[PDB]
């Protein structure tokens with residue numbers, strides 16, 4: 067029996083951070099969505115974050131481009147004293163965070179999740195839940211560089227209380243794990259379970275149209291019985307595709323990135339199966355900067371060789387590099403595409419994890435999966451964004467020269 | 479509890495069919511020819527002979543030819559026709575052909591027993607296995623079909639085990655499976671009769687004495703429907719050899735394709751995933767030697783490139799792919815379906831695998847095949863001889879990289 071449907075007028079908006087200087091031949095910016103959500107917050111706010119560097123002092127900079135971030139943090143400091151219950155879960159850092167301390171003295175609650183001891187990973191998840199009604203899910207960290215100097219993609223769902231509570235369940239898992247003497251139970255309490263998963267997705271009304279949406283979580287130790295693992299959701303979306311698969315992730319690596327080294331061909335085998343068996347067109351867009359793993363190159367070539375007229379398989383790989391000028395090269399750890407999403411002709415997947423084994427086995431993450439039988443919607447907007455990025459002059463084949471790219475790219 | 483050890487003085491001999499015209503440097507340990515081994519086994523046969531074969535073209539009349547190079551094959555056929563009238567019990571199981579086979583009829587009236595196994599009806603495959611069992615004592619296992627071209631015009635590799643009764647009976651078990659399937663109203667049972675089961679497998683290999691030195695040897699069979707409870711599947715044995723390798727993996731097969739060749743198309747990354755895991759995790763050096771002629775699947779090329787791209791200094795993986803092509807001149811180009819390398823084997827620093835199947839999904843899921851796996855803690859032996867053969871072929875001027883031109887190869891090669 068399918069679970070109860072939801073009747074809230076949910077509205078999904080694609081949100082993106084376009085770095086300063088990037089020009090294209092438009093979705094709202096991440097800063098606008100965050101500021102609007104903070105202004106409209108009245109009862110509660112839950113945040114799952116990786117790190118907190120929102121001010122020029124955090125990054126030891128004097129960039130005007132930090133203004134948006136500096137505003138956002140200030141707005142966060144306004145939430146607690148006016149009645150909003152603020153709960154913040156962060157990955158355990160190397161040192162105390164000034165933003166978190168200031169929020170703590172503004173009235174917020176901050177807990178550090180020590181995922182390294184628990185599942186040998188980090189709290190890589192980045193999402194917001196507002197008043198149990200709205201939620202943002204994307205790749206934007208709590209970083210000012212994530213608002214003006216780094217390309218980011220996410221989705222903001224407004225007026226969807228049911229899905230917001232579904233995400234609040236995962237946030238509650240994180241919050242419980244944030245306690246000092248806490249460990250992962252063998253079975254989570256039944257208050258953590260969900261009836262909405264891959265087999266029975268939640269029936270929502272998206273922009274006045276029925277849709278099937280659900281949330282997947284990783285790692286498997288942080289998954290109640292009824293919660294679909296993130297890898298299972300990703301592989302289902304990959305396997306159900308019949309026409310095309312468009313993937314945009316910062317890092318794609320069919321191994322365990324940090325481990326004795328282990329091979330992990332799950333997503334790679336799924337993509338190869340889609341390309342060969344059903345003739346699915348696979349386009350893979352990988353971000354490259356001066357901090358990319360060089361070992362990423364060879365594996366990517368191992369996919370690009372599958373483009374062959376005899377096999378009829380069509381796998382193409384492009385590298386997205388954000389150009390940097392003399393001034394922007396001084397901004398530390400910026401000018402990248404941090405996007406993490408996949409779109410087919412029939413499904414949409416938006417995640418907060420890079421595509422490697424750890425992010426699906428040890429490292430926490432959440433992903434939103436949407437299916438809709440319309441002529442468009444969120445899926446069409448995702449496809450349009452991917453096509454714009456893919457056809458932009460910032461995407462290059464694996465044989466391109468490094469000099470004429472505009473930025474340092476280890477893979478080239 | 480390990481099973482009982484064997485005390486027969488087993489002796490393994492590498493056997494090869496080197497096509498006429500193929501030249502090698504001075505030493506290049508020359509192994510006995512396949513024709514010589516077959517003739518010796520037929521001359522020494524006294525009680526029984528069991529043969530698993532794909533097809534039977536041993537004379538010039540079968541292939542509509544007049545080549546003197548067929549002489550060897552025809553001689554073998556004659557010796558086969560001599561086995562039954564002098565008391566040797568001959569049983570022949572062959573893949574079901576489209577039309578009657580002259581060799582099989584002539585053997586049938588010479589006193590032999592011939593049964594056709596219809597694997598297409600049973601598991602949607604063919605009887606691809608090629609082995610000989612002589613007097614329940616000796617056995618040949620290799621890639622040489624019952625073809626005269628397999629003796630002089632096609633490169634073949636195999637192993638002949640002499641004076642090893644235990645392994646010969648173990649192979650006779652698989653042969654009994656084949657022979658039972660040759661009956662008219664017969665189908666694969668859910669469980670095979672206990673007379674078909676074997677106690678020697680990957681977990682507990684048979685303890686044999688190979689060239690006066692203890693060794694662990696066993697036989698794997700495919701497809702799984704043709705496998706008793708105690709029989710190790712061929713894919714499991716192959717993947718165990720791949721995963722247990724710590725230094726290098728040398729593979730020489732006519733066809734390598736990580737999909738189901740004839741099927742709705744299916745992807746099949748088992749062997750490919752094993753090779754990638756060996757290359758990346760344990761830094762295993764992988765050499766892949768693929769035969770190419772005018773009948774090779776072109777779709778083989780891209781996948782092979784997909785392996786050669788794993789060669790990277792950052793990953794420390796070492797994967798190399800080469801194509802072995804047998805040169806043909808004006809006269810030899812007229813012999814139909816010849817001038818190829820038919821070897822099917824793998825060798826690591828610690829194990830040897832010799833099979834009668836190409837490396838693709840069907841041969842491990844639907845198509846019958848047998849393979850011999852040998853391990854020995856010596857300095858040389860069968861593993862060293864196999865490695866030497868692979869190195870000689872790999873460094874021979876008949877091996878080329880995947881970007882070589884087809885004109886300067888000496889034969890038609892679709893992959894180039």
Ligand SMILES: *[C@@H]1O[C@H](CO)[C@@H](O[C@@H]2O[C@H](CO)[C@@H](O[C@@H]3O[C@H](CO)[C@@H](O)[C@H](O)[C@@H]3O)[C@H](O)[C@H]2NC(C)=O)[C@H](O)[C@H]1NC(C)=O
Pocket residue numbers: 489490491492507508509510511689858859860863
């Ligand atoms: C294990 O024992 C077997 C049997 O005793 C050995 O087989 C023998 O191997 C040698 C060397 O490969 C063969 O000599 C060679 O003969 C060919 C012609 O057949 C000739 O061209 C070479 O120059 C060389 O003289 C020998 O014929 C062969 N014996 C039989 C009966 O076939 C085997 O070498 C031993 N070792 C291993 C690692 O198997």
Ligand SMILES: *[C@@H]1O[C@H](CO)[C@@H](O[C@@H]2O[C@H](CO)[C@@H](O[C@@H]3O[C@H](CO)[C@@H](O)[C@H](O)[C@@H]3O)[C@H](O)[C@H]2NC(C)=O)[C@H](O)[C@H]1NC(C)=O
Pocket residue numbers: 489522640641
């Ligand atoms: C494999 O075994 C055969 C015989 O089983 C070996 O050849 C044979 O060697 C024996 C000498 O030991 C010669 O006489 C034989 O004596 C044994 C007892 O030792 C007996 O059981 C036999 O019936 C026979 O009388 C025999 O002439 C000789 N035969 C041949 C054809 O060479 C052979 O060397 C062993 N190894 C290989 C690689 O074949």
Ligand SMILES: *[C@@H]1O[C@H](CO)[C@@H](O[C@@H]2O[C@H](CO)[C@@H](O)[C@H](O)[C@H]2NC(C)=O)[C@H](O)[C@H]1NC(C)=O
Pocket residue numbers: 077078079094273442443444
């Ligand atoms: C679904 O509804 C949302 C909410 O209205 C749409 O997002 C708005 O899009 C318009 C442009 O069409 C912008 O002017 C608004 O600013 C957006 N809203 C917000 C809060 O930023 C979204 O475009 C709709 N999607 C579809 C496919 O109809």
Ligand SMILES: *[C@@H]1O[C@H](CO)[C@@H](O)[C@H](O)[C@H]1NC(C)=O
Pocket residue numbers: 077224225
């Ligand atoms: C959500 O609901 C409120 C009040 O019902 C409305 O003002 C707002 O526009 C809705 N959200 C969107 C994105 O339209």
Ligand SMILES: *[C@@H]1O[C@H](CO)[C@@H](O)[C@H](O)[C@H]1NC(C)=O
Pocket residue numbers: 504505
């Ligand atoms: C050349 O071959 C012969 C015969 O196989 C062998 O005796 C000789 O040792 C070989 N030459 C060298 C240098 O080993």
